Structures are given as C-alpha cells and as structure tokens.
Design a protein around this ligand. Structure first.
Ligand SMILES: Nc1ncnc2c1ncn2[C@@H]1O[C@H](COP(=O)(O)OP(=O)(O)OP(=O)(O)O)[C@@H](O)[C@H]1O
Ligand SMILES: Nc1ncnc2c1ncn2[C@@H]1O[C@H](COP(=O)(O)OP(=O)(O)O)[C@@H](O)[C@H]1O
Ligand SMILES: Nc1ncnc2c1ncn2[C@@H]1O[C@H](COP(=O)(O)OP(=O)(O)O)[C@@H](O)[C@H]1O
Ligand SMILES: Nc1ncnc2c1ncn2[C@@H]1O[C@H](COP(=O)(O)OP(=O)(O)O)[C@@H](O)[C@H]1O
Ligand SMILES: [Mg+2]
Ligand SMILES: [Mg+2]
Lengths: 145, 194, 948, 145, 48, 145, 48
C-alpha cells in the first residue's frame, strides 16, 4: 500500500513516514537473517524478541491509522464495502500476489469463490464457485494492462 | 414472489413476516437468485444503528445488491425511525430510474446517504424479515412501515416440499413417503411430551 | 449429566480415530457483556473491535497457524437468552454467516462446530431451538455409581501431595470401596438427604463434591500423622478404623451442613439405622456433635470447647472468638474445604458469625491471604477484575497467560460477603456468578482487552450470603453450586449466647471488682432483651429491623468503654449504662412511636427482673444521657447541664463554621449525643434518616466540628458525573489515608446522581478501600504520599503492598461517612440491595420528622421574645389540645404555641386529602414550621409597632 | 418570604411581575439551562442584585448552600460557598425560581428550601378577564370609560 | 387532553374578532347571542 | 424539511432546520418525537423563547403516548388521527385524500372503480371496530393499503 | 544563582534534564501522550 499508491503519502504524511522508519528496521533485520539463516543464529540476535514485539505493535498502529484511506478505496470498488478493514488491506497491499486474493472473493461476490488465472497470473481467464463449477470468460481480463 | 415483485415494481421494500421456520429469509434469497441478484443477509441487532445501516445501504446502492435484513425488529425503536429516512431517500432515487423521461446517457441517479451523494443502482432492493409475535421486539413506526409491503408467511406447504425433495433425490415412493413423514412430524409435536 | 465429559471425550477420541487435531474454545457468553462477546463499533471513529466470539472465529478463518486443518469446536458453556444467541441466527442456519454491524460477513468454515452446553432452555426462543441439533442429557445418564468410580479411580492413581501418599490413598480407597457401591451407605444417605430441607437447593454433585474433598483431607491427615510418627506409621487396622468413621463424619457435613440442626440431627438417626460403622453410644447426643480423632475413635466436640477467660482489654474485640460447639465444628469443616482450595459458601442470617468463622479458620491456615469483596445488586465481574489488578499479576508463560498473586508462596482468597445480591437479569442469569463459575469450573477467564484466556494460579474463592428466601437475595445457579459446598451458620442459641457474652461480661466486670457478682444477671438481661427485640421487630415491619449477635457485641463493647476509666461504680450505675446502650442499639433505628415506647418499657421490665433490690429511679430515670463533653470521662450528664453546654458551643459554631441559628429542643440534644458516639468509633458510619430540613446535615457538621472532624461534601451540579465522584473520592481518601485527617464525609441521597456512586461507597464503607479507585499515575502519587505519611508516624514501610495496607488502616480510623436520606418505604427497602453496607456497616438513626413535642418546644422557645401574655385569657372547657403534655390549666402563650403546632399538623392532613384524591402535593417539612414562627414573630412586632 | 420563592406560573404574568417590580434594582433573567447561569448567579451574589432563574424543573444543586443560607462570617467578611469557590455575599441579593409547568413534581429536599407561590387561574379572575375582553370588543366606548 | 389558558383565550378571541356571523350585525343583544352561541361551537371544534 | 428523531444526527439536523426555518418561513416536520421524551422537553423551552417568521410552522408527529411531556402538549395544538368514526366518514376522507384529476382520467369507468375501492376500504376498516367478529385479528388495514 | 542555571538550559535547549523526576515525569508522560494525540501524532515511546 505504501509503495503502489503515491497518493497515500500526501493523504497521510505522518503514517507514510512512520511506516518507512519501521520498514527500515524490518529490512535491516531481514538482511541479518539472510547472512545467517540458521534458526539458532537468528534466535541469538540481540533483542530479537523485543524487536519483533515492537515491530508487531508499531505495525498495528499504522494498520489502525489507514481507516479513512480504506473508506476512500471502497468507493472505487463498492463490493469492498462488504469487506473488513484488515482483509481490505490484504487485498489492496497484495495486488501483485494474486494467490492471496482467492480467500476474499466469497465476501465480495454471491457465488465467485476463486478466479482462474494463466501460468503467469497476469490474465484472469474466468471465475469458479466453491463447488468447483467454472465460468470461462469470453474475453479474458488482463491484469498487466 | 407475487407480493415482493409488486413491492419491487412500486419501488417499495418487501416485509415478509411470520413465526420462525416458515421460509421468510430463504424465499427472499430465492427470489433474488431467480432474478440473478446478489442477495446479502444481515442478522440485525440493537447495534445496527443509523450510521451502521446507512453505510450498509451505501454499499448495497452502489453494488446493486439486495439487502435482506432479518430480525429487523431487533433494532431499537429510535433507530428504526431514523433508518426510515434513509430507506425513503433511496426509494425516491429508485423511482428516478423508472421515469421514462430519464435517459441512461445523463447524470447518474443519486441519493443522499450519510450526508454524501451516493449513486444508486436500479437493481438494489431492501427486504426485512420479522417475527411480529416475539415479545420484547421493537414496534416499527408507521412511517417506516409504509415503505414496505408486508406478506404473512405462517403455514409452509410441508407436504409439497417433502414430496418434491424426495422425488428430486431419487426416491421412487416419494409420494408415499411424503404422505407419512409430514403427518408424523405433526403427530410428534402433539403425541410427545412438551 | 455428563454433558461436558461427553464432548471432551468425543473430541479426544476423534483425534485418535481420524488423525485430526481437536481444538475446543469454551466461552461463557453470559460471564461477559454482549459488547465483549461480539464486539463494538466505535460511535465516533467508526472503528470495529472484535469481541470474544468474533475474534476466535476470525482467527480460524484467517488460518495463520493452520486452524482450518483442525477440528474446531466453539462451546458456549452458559445460559442461553435471546439477547445474545439470536446474533447467531444467520450462523446456525444454512447461511453459515456471522454478520457484523460494520457490514462484514464471516463465513463459517466446514471444520467448525458451534456447540451450546446448557442446563435448560427456558428462555431460548423457537428461532434458536429450531436451528440447532439437540442432544438431551438426563440426570439418569450419569449414574451415581459412575461418579463414585471416577472419585475412586482418581484416588488410586493421582497423588494428592503433588508413593507414600499414593499408598495411603490406595489403602484408603480399599476401605471406602464397600460404602461407595450402588445401594451402599453413601447412596442411601444421598437419597434421604434430598428429602430434607436445606438452606440452598440441593444437588448430587454439591454433596459428592463436598464429600470427596473431605475424604481427600482424611488421606492428608494420615500422611500428616506419619510425619508426626516417623517411627510407627499408621497400620491398616488403625487406617481402617479411622476411614470408616471419617466417612460417616464427612457424609453428615456434606449432606446436611447446609441444613439446620434439626435436619442435621435427623440425618444422624437415619445413618445410625442403616450403617454398620461403629457410632457414639451416647443416648441423646447427635452424631454431628462428634469428630473423628486420628486414632479412629469418636471424640466429642465438647472436648475442644473450653470455658476460656478473656483478657480484660480484648472484651468483645473483633478478632476474639469465644469457643462454642458450633464454632469449633464450623472451623474444622471450613479448614478442610479451605486447605483443599475448594470454593465454599457460608450461608446464614446477617450477623450469625460467617465472617467470624471464616477468619478464625484462616488463622489456623497460614500461607493464605484473604481479600474482602462486598457484592451489591450492581456488582459486575469488573469488581473482581480490579481486585486482580491490585493483588495479582498477569505473566506470559509458554502455556498462556497466568494470573497469580503478587506475593509468592501465598494462596489468595477472594471473600465475597453478599454473593447472591448481584442483580439477576430477566433471563435468570447473574453475570458475576457465571464469571465465578467459569473461574472455578474452567480455572480461568477471558481477558477482554486481547481476547486471551487467562489461567488462575493460587487463587481460591469463599462466598458469604444470606438465605436466598431473604428479600433482595436470589437463588444461586445449580451449575455454580455443584462446585461450592455450602455450610449453614445459624444464630447462636440462648445457651450459646449466654456462654459467649457471659465470658465477655465476666472479663469486662473485672474492671470493677465490686461488680463481679452481677456478671450472670447482666448477661441474662442482655440475652432476654435481645431475644425479645429480635422477635418483636422483624424485616416484615421494616427492612432494617435486623437484630443479630452484632448488637450483643456492640452492647458489651459499649458498656466496657463506659467502664474503663472508672475506679468504682454502684450496681445502679451499671444498669444505667446497660439501659443506655440498649436504647442506642435497639431504639435508635425504630420508626414508630409505639415501637419506641415498647422498647423503652421492656428495658425497665428486663432490668428489674434480673436486678431486684436496686433503686429504680437512680438507675432508670427516663432521660438517660451520657456524654464526655462536661468531663474527661463518658459519664451520665444532666439534660439541663447539657443544654447549656450545647448553647455555649453553638455560639462559637456560628462565628467559625456556619452562621445558621438553631433552636435547641430535647430531641436535638439526644441526636447530637448519638452522632458524637459514632464519630468516636473506628469506621464510624452514620445513616441519618429523616425528612429534609430537620437538621440532619447541620447537626452532623456541628458534631463534626466539636470532635475535630473536617466536613467534606461533594459539590454536585447538573454536569457532575461518575469520574467527578471518583476524583472527589480520591481527594477524601488522600486526606484521611495519607495526611491523618479526621474527616466527616457527609453525603445525601440527592448527591447520588448514578447507581455507580453507591457501588464505590459500598466498598468504602465495608473495607475502607476501593480496589480500582487509584490507577496509573494516581496510584503512583498515592504511594509517594503514603510513604511520606507513614514516615511522619515513625513506620519503616517501603513496600507498596505494605504502604497500601497502612493507607487502608488510616482510612478505617479517620474517614467517617454520614449518609442522609428521606424516609421512603420503597426506597429504603430498595436501598439495602444497592448498598448493603449502609445497613450493616453504618449505625442507623431514625430522626424522622419533628414530633409534636419538638414542634411545641421550638414554638415556645422561638416565641419567648413575643409578648403573648394575656392575664385575662379564659381557658375554654373544651381545649383543642394537640400537645399531650400541654399543662392542664394552659396559659395564653401555651395556647398560642399549641395552636401553632396544630397549624403545622393540618398541612399533613391537607396533603393526605389531596393525595388520596390523586392531587399533587408538596412535602411539609420542619422548615415550613420555622418559616411559620419566623413570620409570626415579624408580623406581630410589625403590627404591634404600627398600631402603637 | 423567608425562604426564597419558587414561582409556578403557566401563564407567565408572575415572571413579568417580578421583572417589573425589580427594574430599579437591575434584576437579571436567567435559566438553569443557560451556559451563563453560574456566572450570572456569582455576579448576583457578589453585587447583591435580584436574580430570576427559570426552568426550576432542571434545578441545579449548586444553589443548595444559597437556599439554605449557609453563610460563614469570619474576618469581617460574609462568605457563601458556591461549589469550590467562596464568594462574598451582598445583603441585597435575592433569588426567584420559576417554572411554567404546574404539573412538575419537586423532590422533598427542594420543597424544604423554597417558598411555593402558585399562580393558578381562579374562576372569578377569569370571569373578570373575559368580561373585560368582551367589553373591549363590543363596547369600546364603555370599556375605555 | 392538556389545554393551557392561552388556548381558550385564542378561542375566545376568535369568537369576538374573527366571527363571520358578526359581519353585518349591529344590535348589541343579537351580537351577544351570536357570540354566546359561537363560543360553545368553536370550543367544541378546536378541543375535539 | 422532514426529519426523523431517533438518531443523534437527527437532533442536530432538527435544530439547524428549525433555526433556519424560523428566519425564512420554512416548514419543519419532526416525526416520531415520542421516541425522545427528554429532548421534547428541551424543544418546548426552545420554542417558548422564539418569535419566528409569520409563515413558519413546526409539525410534530408522535403516537399517542404517555411519555410525551405535558408541557409540550400545552404549548402546541393537538390533532388526533384515528380511524374514521363510520363508513360515511371513512369514504369522505378517502375521496378528499385522492386528487380529483386522479379519478377523472380518460376511462370514465375509473370513477366507479375508485368508489368501489372506497366502499371496500371503508367496510374492511369499520369491521376492525368489532375486534373479534369483523376480523379474527386487529389487522392494520390503512392508507398504504 | 540556581534559578539561572535552570533558565540557561531552558533558553538553549527548551528542556531541563532533571526538572521532571519521579512522579512528575510519569505525569508529564501521560500529558504528553494526551497532548500529542490531539495533534494527530502516533507517539507512545517515552523518548519520542
Ligand atoms: N462417563 C463418566 N464416567 C465417570 N464419571 C463421569 C462421567 N461423565 C462425567 N463424570 C463425572 O461426573 C461429573 C459430571 O460432570 P460433567 O461436566 O460431565 O457434567 P455436566 O452435565 O456437563 O455439568 P454442568 O451441567 O455443571 O456443566 C463430574 O464429576 C465428572 O468427572
Ligand atoms: N419452499 C421451500 N422449499 C424448500 N425448503 C424450504 C422452503 N421454505 C422454507 N424452506 C426451508 O425451511 C427452513 C427455514 O427457512 P428460513 O427462510 O430460514 O425461514 P424463516 O426466515 O421463516 O426463519 C430452511 O431449511 C429452508 O431451506
Ligand atoms: N462464639 C462467638 N465468639 C465471639 N463472637 C461471636 C461468637 N458468636 C457470635 N459472635 C458475634 O456475632 C457477630 C458475627 O459477626 P460476623 O462474623 O460479621 O457475622 P456474619 O458474617 O454472619 O454477618 C459478631 O458480633 C461476633 O462477635
Ligand atoms: N434545630 C433547628 N433549629 C432551627 N433551624 C433549623 C434546625 N434544624 C434545621 N434548621 C433549618 O433547616 C435548614 C436545613 O438544615 P439541614 O441540616 O440541611 O437539614 P436536613 O439535613 O435535615 O435536610 C437549616 O439551614 C436551618 O435553616
Ligand atoms: Mg429468517
Ligand atoms: Mg458441563
């Protein structure tokens, strides 16, 4: 959300800067894990338990501060009005990771439980129900375009 | 179906009422599914206030979905009066679609929900299902009730439901089975202790 | 009925059969608010917070930790009412959707089952019943043989110490086995017990739960004996000999301990007929009067009841218990349940000794701290949670959150004094009771802030209550009683009272050696008048007509306080103190003049019956007044001498505190003496009941100024709210708890703008502390001030817990609460449930309205300046007399004041006529009379001056 | 009056009569519901001006010391404790409470602090009012005379 | 059925000043009969 | 301007609508005011101290409820709406409520249909007076039907 | 002279390191959290 929507930086300058400050400490701790991916080495990182505890609390604050931004996005796709705030953030923030979107379609549609995607996951070929029944679109929808 | 579609043509809400287990909610969804509409069911309680109902209406109006508000009389009486204003303004907007003078290539129909101008899709509808016999429930104010067409759903046709379901499942003696199972349930309600 | 074990066993069996892990989330829906069950939508920010059920279901749907691959059972173990379960109508039907007011809809995953474990469905509607599969359990499904097997199987496998202990249990299990068969001793005893009358509704598990706890203690007794005898451990012959008698002993107390003595006796003979266990051979002594010694011999309980002599300075002290037959038995029974950490309830009439017995038993049980909670009608689980916040800590453990007392190695006992007062909703549920049942049955509760299960450690519960048939009392749920053994504590009998307070009187009459002989007649007069008053006045007449041994304790203490600074006293002087204290304890609460007349007469009757050969006039002169204002000591004072002193002090009071002149009549002098007594007692709280404008507040301030007490009144207004009252409470507590300032906290019924005001005062009156009043920075500032305050007293207290106890002790001795309220029959009865401390922690003085005597004295005193002398006045043959003691040849001034009294009484008749016709009437108060005589003096002077 | 008067006048002439009678002493009309009531009450007590307070059905218990005349005379000063602030009480102060609802019930504590002055319509007074009104309409020369 | 004095005085004013039955009537006695009759009629009409 | 009363926003909207209307002659109708008895008392005090435009009218809609304050009832003029007393009164009310141009459209037979509907509506409503015999239950046959 | 040692720090840094101590610092942190909230700032850390 804080990368794919430049409008949010102006809308919530405090939140944007806060997230970036936290996003820096997260990435720094990620780089340490990359050097030593052994679990014991990660477990022995100084204050790693307290670092995650602060990261969890701080990221939760940002999450609760995006409510008005979420109400603005619900207008652009009104079926989002029937989705909770946390699930909507997962939908908006994972707009590139389409596989994580599958669990949310039952909330926005009467009988669409999942969508059919090509091998790239760039074109929506059709929709499917919870019982496996598939509808193949006559004109497929391209996510890249 | 006849009563609710008359309300839909009159741009009014449907209000099926009766005791529990008579098919009130399922019939509203069945009619919506018959018309290919997205039917949303809401289990209403006293926490469904004026602000909560309006936001739900905003989603229903823009999507074009049907709102089936079950146990709608579990709202507080003050909230029912307040909600009647939102239901009315949507219904006036719905009649703007039905005007022959209006042309699709114009400004979209819009009603005021929560002090905002909200586009209204012609496919949206409002339905409330209630058990008026339950003591402690809220009485609907008359100005709200005039916005809904009510139908009493009190005696479901059990023997027909049993006969068709058993016949659709492949039971060869569905007529014989239906003529026994439905009276048997009636006998249990009376022969057995309370 | 085995409902819980049925689904707990099935869940484990399916895990083994199918390989799918089974997870159960057990929720008590009525132990929390409906807002905390499903969640709330913020009124302003419109932010949604998940409730307990919504959080659990959302966690399963999100499936962050593989919850969708497990069998998920959500068990609502509690009462079903339409208010909360009808939110699940769309969940339980084919929709399988939890709909939230924020528009969100949560789908029920196929691996989730919604289950409801309930004892009845008498409040569920058809909508709920029709949407759920029903499995009915009967009490016949779980047989008593099955319960006996479970207790014996656990006794033979689970050691009680944490094996020599298991070996004792196994041998004891073999001994108990014959009596625990079907149609055995325990089965026959249980069937007979259900035929008897019990103070609470009787259930099989309450009796068996009590019986099994007692037998576990017997196993611990044998182990403790082996510790005392490392050389010769108990042999099977002695072990057999002990267990059989203890089993009979345990059966009697587990099945009749909640019944009266006659019912306890009757179960004794029935056992004596059917048992083969050897029993005491006394001809007419009930079996319940015998204990079981560790040598397997019946020993009479009377061997542990010595005739003690009490130290003269501990006479009727709150911590002193005179051993009686009931106290030693109840203490031993309480010891067994408490030592096993088994929750228990003491039930009995107010003042029967429930707190005394519980605290006496706790003294013999160290490593246990008691914290007293005082339930009201408005008590919610949040009162328990504040107590947890102050005395306990939440700690994160690998197995979850554990709540344990701050002090290590100690078991913390929550004592609830009125556990059956909390309001029962329209669906038969008390929220706090469901909350306690959850903590006892499930060993914990849910923390609503984070929806996290909290496990209790080293926390046990003790309840006290009045019988459920008493007004304001509700029957306890059977699901809570099955875990709580109930002992019935009745009022001590006439012989027990003679033993208790005869011991006290002997000690207190050692102050005056010349009065030692009169100890027995003094006790006999005390018991006779107390019994007569308790019979004469009951709760049927007035809601506050409760007489208990508490009055006897105050009676002995009152006489003792008036005898300490005395070198000698004649017997007639003793009777006057005895008569004076009787009037203060029995007459001051009476409403009607007939009731007060009866009490006044029978005090004279009882005294002369037990004290012949005394000078009646010098001992029983009707104006009995005692004061320490005219001397150093609390000695009798003449009425006229007292009147001059009060006038002299009122003159100073006008110039320093309140320049509101007061007319002094006889009832005021008695009233100020009564208020002075309470301000000189620790935790001296006053409940002044009377019509507005009768001087209740003014007299309280005047007496408070005479005793050096600062007057605090809350400054209410139209915008005064609950947190304004809390801040005002903090101000008074800091001054009296930290600055050692004696404070008279005078508060009227009109000051109560919300029911939450009295829930705070109910705790303050009883415990001298409010568990949740000081929080956050307020508590930190309080600790700094307490450390400074204790230093000025020369006390080395640094610990926060130590500081808080000292702060409570200061509030107890310095803070005095005066409650003023108008007489309202409905209001007074309702007031007891809202603030039970008002009627058992405050001394009640029924000031009422001004009498005809008071009106006449005010009129005659106020019209002294008036020139009402008419020597030529003729007394009519028929004089319209309204004052009974108006002199037989009345003078013109006497007639005028008599007419002034008549006019005031006419307005009461006038209001009654309009009230009986449905007309609107306004209260007639003594301020109307003061208004009347004031205008009479002014107009008379004005008209006389104009005419002359 | 000795106790301060509580006026019950549904018609409202008593309110006018009180204001007519006290113009020379600068009487101020206020209400228990007004935001300036505490300031107006403090000013009237300090300067000793008559005060007329309406809507006594919403009685503010801040007047309890004023109605009970709980004054403290120390140091040559006459003090009245209004809330948590002490105010010098001028001897010319007077307060009138008024309501327009004849059916209002007052609690016994308020009834003891006030002098009830009820303005009820009497048959004779209404007869005089209606006789005068018809005379004005029908015989204006006679009514003027 | 709550009625103030002003409500009746409005009725009385209506009969005396807004009465169509007094438009041309000049005799005081006949006007009084009209006023008396119309007073009862308007009182019933507005209250009922 | 028509406002329902129950909502908190309805109270704010009612005050603004009334304040605007009393300066412009606008009409304000507040419906279901019996649901807010406490706010109704404050409205009665507000109306008393107000001299609106000569054309301003305030309409309050409420059920016949004992919760409605007496003071509000005295200040306003009460109109009771109930079933018409009889068949004649029922049918006269119906023909007045329906505009004449509605009945008098091109098909001349439309007038007789409306008469039959008016007669049918009167008979059905009047049978409700005979609680049990006219109909087994007290149905709410009304204007909406 | 100790008056100006406090002002010398206050004038230059806008803060006095030892002025708020004990309960005064705890009360200050509560008020700062309330004050920053009214400004729309998500500050919880005491140092922040
Ligand atoms: N199958 C069984 N065999 C032996 N003992 C059992 C069995 N089922 C239950 N019990 C025992 O009998 C008692 C029944 O308790 P359980 O919780 O099963 O009953 P319940 O009806 O669910 O209780 P409640 O109504 O209080 O919630 C317990 O002491 C339990 O240990
Ligand atoms: N016409 C019908 N055919 C089949 N099933 C029906 C029919 N009407 C009702 N049912 C069934 O009856 C049950 C109750 O229906 P529901 O709509 O929930 O009733 P209500 O709204 O009156 O409580 C459901 O199992 C539903 O599918
Ligand atoms: N054996 C006894 N020894 C001392 N006091 C006793 C005894 N029996 C009764 N009392 C008195 O009875 C009263 C019981 O008070 P309390 O324990 O608070 O009663 P409850 O808890 O039943 O309300 C006290 O005044 C106490 O001194
Ligand atoms: N004994 C008395 N003599 C004269 N006036 C009195 C007396 N008692 C009360 N009053 C008058 O009544 C007023 C109200 O007294 P207060 O103590 O507030 O009454 P209560 O507490 O009974 O409501 C006093 O301020 C005083 O004017
Ligand atoms: Mg339904
Ligand atoms: Mg169970």
């Amino acid at each position: 959300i804080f990368t794919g929507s430049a409008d949010i930086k102006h809308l919530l300058p405090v939140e944007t800067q806060r997230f970036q400050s936290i996003s820096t400490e997260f990435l720094a701790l990620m780089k340490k894990v990359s050097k030593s991916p052994l679990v014991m080495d990660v477990l022995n990182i100084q204050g790693v338990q307290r670092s995650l505890e602060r990261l969890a609390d701080l990221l939760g604050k940002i999450q609760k501060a995006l409510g008005e931004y979420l109400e603005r996005e619900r207008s652009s796709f009104p079926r989002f009005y029937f989705v909770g705030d946390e699930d909507l953030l997962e939908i908006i923030g994972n707009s590139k990771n389409v596989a994580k979107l599958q669990k949310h379609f039952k909330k926005m549609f009467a009988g669409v439980s999942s969508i059919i995607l090509n091998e790239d996951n760039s074109v929506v070929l059709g929709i499917s129900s919870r019982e496996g029944e598939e509808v193949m679109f006559k004109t497929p929808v391209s996510i890249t375009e | 179906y006849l009563t609710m579609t008359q309300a839909l043509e009159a741009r009014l809400g449907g209000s099926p009422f009766g005791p529990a287990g008579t098919g009130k909610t399922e019939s509203v969804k069945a009619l919506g599914h018959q018309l290919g509409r997205f039917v949303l069911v809401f289990n209403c309680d006293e926490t469904f206030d004026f602000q909560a109902m309006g936001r739900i209406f905003v989603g229903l109006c823009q999507v074009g979905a049907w709102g089936c508000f079950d146990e709608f009389n579990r709202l507080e009486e003050r909230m029912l009066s307040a909600v009647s204003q939102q239901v009315q303004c949507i219904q006036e907007a719905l009649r703007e679609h039905s005007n022959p003078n209006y042309d699709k290539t114009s400004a979209p129909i819009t009603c005021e929900l929560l002090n905002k101008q909200v586009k209204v899709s012609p496919d949206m509808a409002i339905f409330i299902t209630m058990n008026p016999g339950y003591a402690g429930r809220s009485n609907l104010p008359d100005n709200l009730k005039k916005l809904f067409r009510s139908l009493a759903m009190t005696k479901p046709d059990r023997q027909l439901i049993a006969q068709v379901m058993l016949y659709s499942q492949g039971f060869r003696t569905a007529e014989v089975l239906a003529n026994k199972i439905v009276p048997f349930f009636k006998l249990c309600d009376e022969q057995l202790s309370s | 009925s085995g409902k819980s074990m049925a689904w707990r066993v099935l869940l484990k069996a399916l895990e083994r059969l199918e390989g799918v892990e089974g997870v159960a989330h057990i929720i008590d829906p009525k132990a929390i608010s409906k807002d905390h069950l499903y969640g709330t939508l913020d009124p302003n920010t419109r932010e949604w917070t998940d409730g307990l059920f919504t959080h659990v279901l959302r966690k399963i749907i999100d499936s962050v930790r593989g919850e969708l691959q497990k069998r998920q059972w959500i068990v609502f173990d509690g009462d079903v009412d339409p208010e909360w379960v009808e939110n699940l109508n769309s969940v339980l039907d084919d929709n399988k959707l939890l709909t939230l007011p924020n528009g969100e809809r949560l789908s029920l995953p196929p691996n989730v089952r919604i289950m409801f474990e309930v004892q009845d469905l008498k409040y569920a509607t058809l909508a709920t019943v029709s949407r759920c599969g029903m499995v009915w359990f009967s009490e016949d499904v779980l047989s008593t043989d099955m319960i006996f097997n479970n207790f014996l199987a656990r006794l033979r496998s689970i050691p009680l110490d944490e094996s020599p202990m298991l070996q004792i249990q196994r041998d004891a299990a073999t001994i108990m086995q014959p009596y625990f068969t079907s149609n055995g001793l325990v089965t026959k005893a249980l069937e007979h017990a259900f035929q008897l009358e019990h103070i609470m509704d009787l259930t099989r598990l309450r009796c068996l739960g009590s019986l099994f706890s007692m037998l576990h203690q017997a196993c611990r007794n044998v182990a403790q004996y082996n510790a005392n005898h490392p050389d010769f451990p108990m042999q099977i012959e002695q072990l057999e000999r002990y267990i059989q008698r203890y089993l009979v002993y345990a059966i009697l107390w587990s099945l009749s301990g909640d019944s009266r003595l006659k019912m306890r006796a009757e179960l004794g003979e029935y056992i004596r007929r059917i048992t083969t266990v050897p029993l005491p051979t006394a001809p007419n002594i009930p079996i319940i009067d015998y204990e079981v010694s560790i040598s397997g011999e019946w020993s009479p309980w009377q061997a542990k009841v010595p005739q003690i002599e009490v130290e003269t300075h501990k006479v009727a002290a709150p911590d002193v218990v005179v051993p009686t037959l009931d106290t030693v038995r109840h203490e031993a029974l309480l010891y067994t349940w408490l030592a096993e950490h088994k929750p228990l309830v003491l039930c009995g009439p107010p003042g029967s000794g429930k707190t005394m017995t519980l605290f006496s038993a706790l003294r013999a049980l160290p490593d246990m701290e008691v914290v007293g909670l005082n339930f009201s009608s408005a008590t919610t689980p949040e009162l328990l949670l504040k107590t947890f916040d102050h005395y306990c800590e939440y700690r994160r453990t690998p197995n979850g959150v554990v709540l344990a007392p701050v002090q290590l190695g100690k078991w913390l006992v929550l004592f609830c004094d009125e556990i059956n007062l909390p309001d029962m909703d329209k669906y038969g549920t008390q929220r706090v009771i469901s909350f306690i049942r959850q903590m006892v049955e499930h060993g914990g509760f849910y923390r609503t802030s984070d929806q996290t299960w909290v496990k209790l450690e080293r926390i046990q519960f003790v309840g006290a209550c009045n019988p459920p048939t008493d007004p304001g009392r509700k029957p306890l749920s059977h699901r809570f009683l099955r875990h709580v053994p109930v002992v019935y504590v009745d009022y001590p009998g006439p012989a027990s009272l003679t033993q208790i307070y005869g011991t006290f009187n002997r000690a207190m009459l050692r102050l005056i050696p010349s009065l030692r002989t009169y100890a027995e007649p003094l006790t006999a007069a005390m018991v006779e008048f107390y019994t007569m008053s308790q019979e004469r006045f009951t709760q049927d007449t007035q809601p506050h007509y409760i007489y208990s041994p508490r009055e006897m304790t105050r009676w002995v203490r009152g006489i003792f306080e008036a005898l300490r600074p005395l070198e000698t006293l004649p017997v007639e002087g003793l009777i006057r103190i005895w008569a004076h204290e009787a009037l203060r304890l029995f007459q001051d609460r009476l409403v009607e003049d007939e009731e007060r007349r009866w009490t006044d007469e029978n005090i004279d009757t009882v005294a002369l019956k037990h004290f012949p050969n005394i000078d009646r006039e010098k001992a029983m002169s009707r104006p009995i007044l005692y004061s320490n204002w005219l001397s150093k000591d609390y000695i009798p004072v003449d009425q006229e001498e007292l009147r001059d002193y009060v006038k002299a002090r009122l003159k100073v009071f006008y110039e320093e505190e309140l320049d509101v002149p007061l007319v002094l009549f006889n009832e005021v002098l008695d009233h100020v003496l009564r208020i002075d007594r309470i301000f000189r007692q620790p935790q001296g709280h006053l409940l002044l009941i009377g019509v507005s404008g009768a001087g209740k507040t003014t007299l309280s301030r005047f007496v408070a100024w005479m005793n050096g007490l600062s007057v605090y009144q809350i400054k209410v207004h139209r915008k005064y709210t609950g947190e304004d009252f809390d801040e005002d409470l903090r101000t008074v507590l800091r001054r009296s708890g930290c600055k050692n300032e004696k404070i008279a906290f005078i508060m009227d019924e009109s000051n109560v703008l919300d029911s939450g005001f009295l829930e705070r005062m109910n705790t303050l009156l009883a415990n001298g502390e409010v568990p949740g009043l000081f929080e956050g920075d307020e508590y930190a500032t309080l600790m700094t001030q307490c450390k400074e305050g204790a230093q000025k007293e020369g006390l080395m207290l640094d610990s926060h817990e130590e500081l808080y106890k000292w702060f409570t002790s200061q509030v107890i001795r310095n803070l005095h609460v005066v409650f003023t309220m108008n007489p309202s029959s409905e209001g007074l009865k309702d007031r007891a449930a809202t603030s039970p401390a008002l009627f058992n922690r405050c001394v009640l003085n029924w000031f009422g309205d001004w009498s005809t005597e008071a009106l006449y004295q005010v009129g005659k005193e106020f019209t002294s300046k008036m020139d009402l002398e008419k020597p030529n006045y003729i007394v009519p043959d028929y004089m319209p007399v309204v004052y009974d003691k108006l002199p037989q040849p009345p003078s013109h001034r006497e007639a005028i004041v008599n007419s002034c009294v008549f006019v005031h009484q006419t307005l009461h008749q006038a209001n009654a006529r309009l009230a009986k016709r449905g007309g609107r009437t306004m209260a007639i108060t003594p301020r109307h009379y003061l208004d009347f005589i004031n205008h009479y003096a002014n107009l008379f002077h004005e008209k006389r001056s104009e005419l002359e | 009056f000795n106790r301060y008067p509580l006026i019950i006048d549904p018609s409202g002439q008593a309110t006018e009569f009180i204001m007519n009678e006290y113009k020379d002493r600068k009487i101020t009309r206020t209400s228990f519901l007004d935001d300036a009531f505490r300031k107006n009450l403090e000013s009237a007590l300090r300067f000793g001006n008559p005060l007329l307070v309406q809507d006594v059905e919403s009685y503010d218990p801040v007047l309890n010391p004023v109605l009970n005349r709980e004054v403290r005379r120390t140091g040559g000063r006459v003090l009245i404790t209004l809330g948590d602030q002490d105010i010098d009480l001028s001897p010319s102060f007077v307060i009138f409470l008024s309501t327009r609802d004849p059916t209002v019930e007052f609690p016994p504590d308020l009834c003891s602090r006030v002098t009830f002055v009820n303005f009820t319509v009497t048959r004779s007074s209404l007869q005089s009012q209606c006789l005068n009104e018809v005379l004005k309409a029908e015989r204006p020369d006679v009514d003027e005379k | 059925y709550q009625y103030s004095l002003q409500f009746f005085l409005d009725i009385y004013h209506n009969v005396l000043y807004e009465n169509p039955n007094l438009k041309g009537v000049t005799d005081h006695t006949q006007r009084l009969s009209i006023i008396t009759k119309d007073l009862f009629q308007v009182a019933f009409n507005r209250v009922a | 301007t028509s406002i329902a009363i129950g909502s908190a926003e309805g109270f704010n909207q009612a005050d603004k609508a009334i304040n605007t209307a009393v300066k412009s002659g606008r009409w304000v109708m507040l419906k279901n005011v019996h649901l807010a008895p406490g706010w109704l008392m404050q409205l009665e005090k507000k109306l008393h101290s107000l001299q609106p435009h000569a054309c301003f009218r305030l309409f309050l809609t409420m059920e016949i409820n004992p919760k409605v304050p007496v003071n509000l009832l005295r200040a306003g003029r009460i109109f009771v709406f109930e079933p018409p007393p009889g068949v004649k009164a029922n049918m006269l009310r119906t023909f007045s409520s329906i505009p004449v141009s509605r009945i008098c459209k091109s098909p001349n037979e439309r007038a007789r249909l409306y008469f039959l509907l008016a007669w049918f509506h009167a008979i059905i409503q009047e049978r409700l007076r005979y609680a049990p015999l006219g109909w087994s239950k007290k149905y709410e046959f009304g204007e909406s039907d």
